[PDB]
Amino acid sequence: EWEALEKKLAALESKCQAXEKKLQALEKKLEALEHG
Amino acid sequence: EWEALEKKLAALESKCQAXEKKLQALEKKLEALEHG
Amino acid sequence: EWEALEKKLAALESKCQAXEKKLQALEKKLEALEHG
Numbered sequence: 001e002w003e004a005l006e007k008k009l010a011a012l013e014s015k016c017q018a019x020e021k022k023l024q025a026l027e028k029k030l031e032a033l034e035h036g
Numbered sequence: 037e038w039e040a041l042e043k044k045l046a047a048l049e050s051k052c053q054a055x056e057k058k059l060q061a062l063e064k065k066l067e068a069l070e071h072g
Numbered sequence: 073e074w075e076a077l078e079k080k081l082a083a084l085e086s087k088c089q090a091x092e093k094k095l096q097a098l099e100k101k102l103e104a105l106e107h108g
């Protein structure tokens with residue numbers, strides 16, 4: 001049961017880290033447009 | 037203790053899912069701003 | 073081990089909340105530009 005909790009936390013971290021990456025990509029595309 | 041942690045984990049999973057839905061809507065918003 | 077699980081969850085909650093603040097700032101920039 002503690003391993004299952006550890007796995008859920010690790011999967012949530014993975015999801016959020018990808019989320020952060022997609023947000024970084026959006027900000028970069030907006031910067032290219034404003035400076036285009 | 038166990039139930040209090042599960043409650044917070046479930047709330048965090050729901051928050052991260054809503055976080056993704058917002059990010060997808062902003063992506064469409066940026067695309068429209070560039071396309072105009 | 074339990075304390076480490078609690079510490080991980082709290083760090084993930086703080087990270088998602090910082091994520092939300094950054095998304096809100098991006099949304100405000102997109103709203104300002106699309107109606108400006």
Ligand code: PRO
Pocket residue numbers: 034035
């Ligand atoms: O504040 C500035 O420097 C940038 C220049 C392009 C749009 N805004």
Ligand code: PRO
Pocket residue numbers: none
């Ligand atoms: O960020 C600021 O300080 C101002 C107040 C709203 C619009 N920009």
Ligand SMILES: [Cl-]
Pocket residue numbers: 034
């Ligand atoms: Cl601009």
Ligand SMILES: [Hg+2]
Pocket residue numbers: 015016019051052055087088091
């Ligand atoms: Hg998140």
Ligand SMILES: [Zn+2]
Pocket residue numbers: 001002003
């Ligand atoms: Zn175990």
Ligand SMILES: [Zn+2]
Pocket residue numbers: 067070071072
């Ligand atoms: Zn276009």
Ligand SMILES: [Zn+2]
Pocket residue numbers: 102103106107
């Ligand atoms: Zn708008």
